[PDB]
Every structure is written in structure tokens, then in C-alpha cells.
């Protein structure tokens, strides 16, 4: 797998391999519920559409930057429990991270990393 | 660790603080909380850490 | 890249090695913000002059 969607020409592909499979083996899990205990490799069932969904909610990503609102704030106001459970769900738009105190926000320290790889995922 | 003065240690996420380094992970895996950059919670990340993944899943499969 | 510049006499290569190559590194890094983050081998634009006069002013500071 790791070649196949993973490359190491980049400086950082390494954290890209870690949360990539990361966010796959949680979604094979995701998939297959029955087996007590799963490992990454062992075959079972995941889907290509959910990685990329996840790839590029995360490629997006802001919280909110005041005190007890540390969590990815949506349109909505809403903000979630758990990154994947709803971003493999389906991508979704996030406000403007903006100095403004009303819209105070915080940007992703992962961020901006994921746009070259994910293009090239799309066009292969 | 935190960048906190007088805490030169491992935190963990009750903020608890051990002397030896060497009998806290052997007992037990650790539950750290990881740092943002407020200066209450601002902390350090180890050196250790960000090198060793290939080998440790590796080793983990054989 | 190396050979170029850096030669085998001058006995001060212990640290200025990886002074000169982590000074490329960190200028590239900043010359090209718009990329991630910079290293070595990367046939990124850059300006190595400034590293120049960078190593001049470090070498001044106090």
C-alpha cells in the first residue's frame, strides 16, 4: 500500500504517511465491526472515496480559539466529537479563521500540507 | 514536557510529576496531553519522538 | 553542492559543516513560505547570499 499511495519525494511525507494510515486502519475498523481485535495490514474491507473526503475536510482545518472552544467550529457553530466520524462522513466548509474577537479562530498546524498530495491522489 | 518553569519533566495529564523516567513507561503505557502554544498550556514536544514510526510499526507486524 | 565551497583543508569543518548546511536549509524554509516548509535537496528558488551575510551577523551577535 505504502508506495502505491504514498510518496517519499516530500520533506514531510512522513506525517502524511502517519495520519493517511492512520485515518485508513479507523476506517477499515470503521468498516468491519464484528472481529474483537483487527491489525493495519490484516485484509479487510475500506473504501478509497472516504480517505479522500478525509484528506481534504482536514486540508481545511480551523478551531475555535477561546477558552473550552477547542474543537473544529462549522458554519453551523456546531462542533464535534470526533474528527472522522463526521468528516469521512462528507467534506464540509468551515468559516474564516479571522482576528476579529467575534470570529476569533485558530489554524490547523497541519494545514496546507495536503493540497499538492491530494490533486495527484484525484488525477492517478 | 512543559516549558513551565521548575517543571523540567515529563507531564502527564494529570500534571503529575515523576523523578525517574525509566519506571514510569516500563509500568505502563502513558496518556500525555499534547501542547498548544497558550503560554498556560504551552508545552514541548520530545525530540524522541517524529523519527521512530517506521520502525515501530514494523515491529508491530512481525 | 558541497564540493563547490566547502574544501577538506580548513580544520574548522567539525560543526560548520552542518552550520552551512542548516543554514541553506532554514533560509530556504523562509525564502519560499508559500511551500511547506524547506530542506536540503530541494531545486526550490532560493538566495544564499543573505545566508551569507545571515553567517556575518551571527558571527557579530553578543
Do not use: W
Not at 479507523?26 to 475500506?46: A, E, G, M
Not at 463526521?86 to 474564516?96: C, R, T
Amino acid at each position: 500500500l505504502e508506495q502505491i499511495f504514498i510518496e517519499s519525494n516530500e520533506h514531510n511525507s512522513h506525517n502524511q504517511i502517519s495520519q493517511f494510515r492512520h485515518a485508513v486502519v479507523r476506517n477499515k475498523c470503521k468498516h468491519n465491526p464484528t472481529l474483537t481485535n483487527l491489525s493495519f495490514d490484516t485484509p479487510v474491507y475500506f473504501s478509497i472515496d472516504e480517505v479522500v473526503t478525509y484528506l481534504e475536510n482536514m486540508n481545511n482545518e480551523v478551531i475555535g480559539k477561546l477558552a473550552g472552544e477547542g474543537k473544529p467550529k462549522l458554519a453551523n457553530e456546531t462542533l464535534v466529537s470526533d474528527r472522522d466520524e463526521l468528516y469521512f462522513d462528507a467534506v464540509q466548509s468551515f468559516i474564516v479563521a479571522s482576528q476579529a474577537a467575534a470570529t476569533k479562530a485558530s489554524n490547523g498546524p497541519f494545514n496546507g500540507e495536503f493540497d499538492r498530495m491530494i490533486l495527484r491522489l484525484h488525477t492517478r
